[PDB]
Amino acid sequence: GKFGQQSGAIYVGNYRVVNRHLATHNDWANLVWEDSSRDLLVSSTTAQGCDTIARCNCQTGVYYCSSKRKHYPVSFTKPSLIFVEASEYYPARYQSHLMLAVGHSEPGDCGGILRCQHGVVGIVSTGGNGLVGFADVRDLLWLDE
Amino acid sequence: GQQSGAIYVGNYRVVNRHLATHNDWANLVWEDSSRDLLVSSTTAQGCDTIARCNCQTGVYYCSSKRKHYPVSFTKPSLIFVEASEYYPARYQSHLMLAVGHSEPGDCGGILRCQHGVVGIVSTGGNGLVGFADVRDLLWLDE
Ligand SMILES: [Zn+2]
Numbered sequence A: 001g002k003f004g005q006q007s008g009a010i011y012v013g014n015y016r017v018v019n020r021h022l023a024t025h026n027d028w029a030n031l032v033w034e035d036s037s038r039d040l041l042v043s044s045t046t047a048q049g050c051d052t053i054a055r056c057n058c059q060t061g062v063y064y065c066s067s068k069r070k071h072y073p074v075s076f077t078k079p080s081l082i083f084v085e086a087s088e089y090y091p092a093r094y095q096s097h098l099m100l101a102v103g104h105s106e107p108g109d110c111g112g113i114l115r116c117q118h119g120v121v122g123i124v125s126t127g128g129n130g131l132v133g134f135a136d137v138r139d140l141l142w143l144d145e
Numbered sequence B: 001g002q003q004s005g006a007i008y009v010g011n012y013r014v015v016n017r018h019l020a021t022h023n024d025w026a027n028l029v030w031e032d033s034s035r036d037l038l039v040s041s042t043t044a045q046g047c048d049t050i051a052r053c054n055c056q057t058g059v060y061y062c063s064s065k066r067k068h069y070p071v072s073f074t075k076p077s078l079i080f081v082e083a084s085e086y087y088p089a090r091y092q093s094h095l096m097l098a099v100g101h102s103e104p105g106d107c108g109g110i111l112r113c114q115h116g117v118v119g120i121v122s123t124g125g126n127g128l129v130g131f132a133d134v135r136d137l138l139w140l141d142e
């Protein structure tokens, strides 16, 4: 402990990484960094997190889909700037650093973790039209403080 | 299992509408701009079989990589597509998506499953390959 698991967050060092749209009041009071275009928010924690962030260029991995109660292996795109249709939390807009795969994603699946052999790749962010999008974390080097 | 850039079934040739030739247009059977599809008549009989199934996995040919790739793909739907040389930004109908290489020259590559031809490469960008679904056009084998 502490591991993110299915909790909807990544815990690395003194940081907690969540979907920005799911961030709690405490997250915001504890804010480190947040970017709406990436749907990401990072808060500071007292306890030390055990998740390892992948530094690689893997395009294949496995994510947890809560709505199906299953892990799925997926091929996914490199992170890019992609138009995303409106959700409950965002208008139709361009989202940055987003990776897409074919898979099931309901709003409740957000926060599901995508992993490869090297560590945590990203978290479920978007869904619909039979695609699941993941916000990439691999470029944020400062998470490894 | 041919890849010529077109599907040949019976007396029909199925091609991307944006790649259709003058001869295709002089031979026109049906075309739909929102689907990026055009069908023309042919003199010679084609050997392709159109899949009637529900399959969401298959194999497509990517000309730019000179490779066939196994892919899982979405059910056909109405999808926003960024502007290309041939179309303005718009919603394209009956489009199925997978993760894969798709360049403009890859249009016409055929997606197949064990049952037959599923669709043809239509779109690409941000690391996705889109395929225009042909499985609903029943009249192709009628
Ligand atoms: Zn990796």
Ligand SMILES: [Zn+2]
Pocket: B051, B053, B054, B055, B113, B114, B115, B116
């Ligand atoms: Zn099939």
